[PDB]
Write a protein that binds this ligand. Sequence first.
Ligand code: HEM
Ligand code: HEM
Lengths: 715, 715
Amino acid sequence: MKYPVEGGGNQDWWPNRLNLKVLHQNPAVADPMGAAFDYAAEVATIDVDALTRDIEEVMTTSQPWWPADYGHYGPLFIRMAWHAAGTYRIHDGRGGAGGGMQRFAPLNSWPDNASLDKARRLLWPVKKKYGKKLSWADLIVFAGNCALESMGFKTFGFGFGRVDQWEPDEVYWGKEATWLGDERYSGKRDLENPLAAVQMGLIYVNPEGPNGNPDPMAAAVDIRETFRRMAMNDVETAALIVGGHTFGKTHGAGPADLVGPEPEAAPLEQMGLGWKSSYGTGTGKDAITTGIEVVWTNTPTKWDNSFLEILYGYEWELTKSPAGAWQYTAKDGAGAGTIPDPFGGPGRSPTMLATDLSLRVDPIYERITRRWLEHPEELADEFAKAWYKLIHRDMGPVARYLGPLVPKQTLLWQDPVPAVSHDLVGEAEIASLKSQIRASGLTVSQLVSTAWAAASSFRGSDKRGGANGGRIRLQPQVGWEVNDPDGDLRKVIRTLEEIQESFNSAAPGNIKVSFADLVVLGGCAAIEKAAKAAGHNITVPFTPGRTDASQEQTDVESFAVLEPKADGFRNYLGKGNPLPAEYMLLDKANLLTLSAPEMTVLVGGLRVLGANYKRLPLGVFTEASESLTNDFFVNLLDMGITWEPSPADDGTYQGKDGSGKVKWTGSRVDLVFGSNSELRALVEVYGADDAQPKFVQDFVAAWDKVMNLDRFDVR
Amino acid sequence: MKYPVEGGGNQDWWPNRLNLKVLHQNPAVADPMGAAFDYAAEVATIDVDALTRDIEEVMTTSQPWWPADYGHYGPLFIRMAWHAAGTYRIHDGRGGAGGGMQRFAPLNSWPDNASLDKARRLLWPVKKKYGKKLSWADLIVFAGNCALESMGFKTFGFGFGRVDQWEPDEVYWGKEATWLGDERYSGKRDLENPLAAVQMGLIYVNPEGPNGNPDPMAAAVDIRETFRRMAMNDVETAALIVGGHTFGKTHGAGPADLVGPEPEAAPLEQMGLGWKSSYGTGTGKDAITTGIEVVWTNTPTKWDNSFLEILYGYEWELTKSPAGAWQYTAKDGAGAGTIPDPFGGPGRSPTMLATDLSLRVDPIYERITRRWLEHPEELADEFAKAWYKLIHRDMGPVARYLGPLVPKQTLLWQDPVPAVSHDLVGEAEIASLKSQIRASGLTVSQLVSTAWAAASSFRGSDKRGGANGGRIRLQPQVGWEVNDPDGDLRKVIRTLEEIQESFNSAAPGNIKVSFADLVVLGGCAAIEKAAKAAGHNITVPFTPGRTDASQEQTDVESFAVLEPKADGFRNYLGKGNPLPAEYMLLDKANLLTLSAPEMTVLVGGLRVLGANYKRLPLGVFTEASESLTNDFFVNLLDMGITWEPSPADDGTYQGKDGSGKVKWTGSRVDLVFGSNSELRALVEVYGADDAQPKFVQDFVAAWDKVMNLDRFDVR
Ligand code: HEM
Ligand code: HEM
């Protein structure tokens, strides 16, 4: 239908096709910074106090195009930072403040991010001054932290180092083609995975209650669950909501139909700004943001215990803002004129949202907030800890936290590992340990499967998971179905520990090795052994420095989201995946941050290496096992094989030769590489006659890339 | 509505949004070969005789799964090769066999490319043997050439060098959301630019004549027009149809309703193959491809004059193929039994497509073909020329042609340039000529605008245009309205020619300089002088070797598609553009092979330098013109400036200050950078405090790229 410059593509002719562009997000060519750029280096040199001072100058310097409530943009900036982090979800670890995504589509034009577009525009003079040394990602969330401290709250600390990106993160936010649409519930109130919001374009919940019904008791069930799915428990949730509504006010001064198009749909001349309003001045006094007109506290620019003193201090009755939105006001005209107007007007009466009353009406939130009514210091403590978690949740290993405000305290949710407490294995020790692992009885399959089990639990979205920690032998990973607990895993683990014990006893100097490194090295040792069986002498690069975590450093509930329901690299398909196998493979490869070439060598390599879940013959197109050849590619391209969906319809295929006899069996994941015109192209590369040396080179680079995915401790 | 891995994204929310992904086509990460892969160097090592011998072995080895007509895949490959080359179009330069795009969507699944899927599959054995030394793109068309030569036609030559791409070139193929749909004609017949076919998914025209109506006279008008829009005049067109239809047959044995889904829509087990038919055996003698059943000649695996002897030897009556396709057969039962069956069956009568008859019904075609009836040697000669052109039209400069089979003869369609006659200007002479161009009194705008005019004539689609040839002083480029001929251009030519003489006829020595690189050098000296005005000492790098073409080496009607109806880099926008200015900018930058970073720095760079068409102040956001600064970027992010469309709605905007006076004017092209969320990110990089050296550094790398786009003579 359309020009490519305007969006036309192959997806238009075949709507449901495999979209391989998820394997080339943020390509170097789109990046203006050049290959040598390293943000971490830059921001480590930034003057934090100059930055803070300049932010605090922006916060108190009102701008005519969006005048500042109470002469302070602070509350506006805490909501910005809360919304930027607030998109995070646990199921896949996507969203979050990590990549500065609120500045792009569709997040920059979510209905719930209305007036954040001006909010980030106000911070331009800060970015202007600090340039390369300060990512918008870092600035957006830091501005909120500064807002907090500016207005009287001592934050627990802050980590710099979020890398700014240049095109939007393609995230599934839901199936609704309508803003604020809700097609995400089944059963009683079961919310569709991976989502962590109640409707499309909202951060968590409806400010007017479930589906717009201002029932605080019901709303609490939505707050409990969305926040759960953003890694927040009851105490953190409560802490955050009260902590947050302690500052600022909502905006709904006129009718919402008087508000223009969201930033993405808006006129060129609006310069990236959206929701331009025709009500009065359309800003400041006359500002419509949500359509709700609430000022929770008498001190909207100061941290105190006023929020709870009000919530519990008055009785609440349902009412309508000047835009027709549900909210609560204090009964019997009580508190008449106690709350101040943003722009000097007369005082107002106490107001709360339906969701604020959830904190008072829900049994659990009741016990928590009535406690902080009487003991306000516990609230600061819990908000401090929660806010730090909020804006850092998706920054992964603490190695990534940069700057003078990063505190020393280790947090369980950071999935911490011990510091390196001995000398690391040098070249001679690695070569020693490789030989030992090869002499241990463990097979190529066992070592490669265990190594892959451990490293491929990493996801690039929130940077959780991976081989570091040696968590493969801890719960839950030790009992994951894909890691095949009742399988060989425990034989492999016990063997690697004995070698760990052996080496660490006989070891020279003060060199000691971790189990975590040995798992990975066993993989590297096995890939060398296989390469030689195939007539190649290569060594597989290993990078030491993994440490072993204890069960107590490993939150079992938090690691549950990291369990694969599918792994196409092991020909594993569990139940409950949203899409057919091959779409789950691209997603798994996207999570491991792999290119299409890198995904392709790994599948083919791993199949002939025997990495398949339960050692199934699906996609093992080779006569020689324990041998790193390109056989998978050669055979998938063989036209002597006729492929047919299996008689016992089980998601598998039969490859029959000329005689009629089955030679090969395949999964959908296996066949997709002969079927997808773009994957076949990659298969014709590594399936050529000159191709086997290149296949081994590229497999090893890929495998190494995966083993090192969580290694921010050495980058 | 959908997951990103199923194609879901921001276009779903905002359908007509500027799609910047056109600027990162073929990302390096999706390429499995590696940054250091050099195809030129690979193909240099091939045994072309051994390749040919292997191709010949493929053509004569029938495969069970698609058996060979007359035991020879030659003609199928000729059609494959013809279809590969035959998507090209002059308006765009896009399409062609140059990228081996026929193996990817949407071209692999076009209705007209039916059974070509099988034809390419047949070549795997060759590609498998040769590996990286042979691209699919080269192999597809070379198989065609080999075919011709194996069946007794000596071809003019062949050049290797077509690099395989890894993702489909997304090209605008038409409005139609239906296959074979037609929504591309207005008026009597005027075809929609930039299209060069009469329906969606057709190479040129309907075999059954316009809209299935088998009027040979009318079909000829369509052949003329589509073939013209693919660079073929009447002789070439007639030579090609005749030459091709000397070989093979059409396939329409049974009903099209019994033929399956095309490759992109077909089940995994078919392994990238499509249109599987349930009619009979579904292959060979039962093969259905178009629905037409025509064998043109009596020696379908041999070159002779029998196509024309048959076309003129009989009288043709309208009939229907076994599939209800219009086609012609010899009246009066004549020529019964004379045409052989592809698989041993009995003889059959002569048959011709409606479009074949166009060749004796059309006055011009008729003159041309009736000549070749008695003068076959002139058909041989013209076909060889046309086929060569067909297979090479998108190769660009002759320097790109590789292998032992490239002929010596210069051809006018290759837009040739003289070889380098005498010695090249060295470092002393470069800086000497530099200083001398600055001391010319030609202004920074003049020098820069002229240098851009020349180099930005290039398009990386067919690799035509650019500053080699010094064609800016020749017709039609010196007349191009965007090159603003009624302005400075003549004076700039005069003055650079004057300096050319002065340098060449000054000091005896072996060194000579051309006007071609003097235009580029002058632009380069201007940009050195501009950067000095804003306090940077830089050497803009420059490579010599450009040579001057003559008017006689410049085909004025051929260069007419190379004319910009829009150049956003000069803020020019003519009439007749299909899309608004900002889209035409992204298309332009795509044809210049630019990245979004590169586009961005060049616009703002060229804005302040004075490169604007008619020197308009639109986007010239600077106080100090002819000085190289990041001003454009600083100023587009100034919030003190309010943008509104101009009262005289001329596509222009006004940027007023606090006082309400207009400080700036801009077009769509200018403000898109301050409006689009991804483009604003880039201008926020170049407009920050620390950016000026980086802007300049990047502007010059981007500039040296545009100047060098031509220069396959030196890489
Ligand atoms: C139960 C979940 C939550 C709901 C339903 C909710 C809802 C809202 C609404 C409707 C507004 C008014 C927006 C406007 O019209 O300007 C608002 C403002 C605000 N929110 Fe919340 N919010 C939630 C959680 C939080 C959290 C966790 C924080 C941060 C810790 C937070 C911080 C703020 C701040 C500082 C403002 C004031 C903005 C300004 O003054 O301009 N909220 N919230
Ligand atoms: C207006 C121009 C043309 C029209 C309308 C046209 C139409 C057709 C059609 C309908 C077929 C049969 C496809 C099938 O059912 O298998 C065909 C086949 C063929 N074409 Fe053309 N064609 C044109 C030009 C050409 C050209 C320019 C060449 C190359 C010089 C060419 C070479 C061939 C060959 C070799 C076959 C036989 C394929 C085989 O034996 O499998 N054709 N053409």
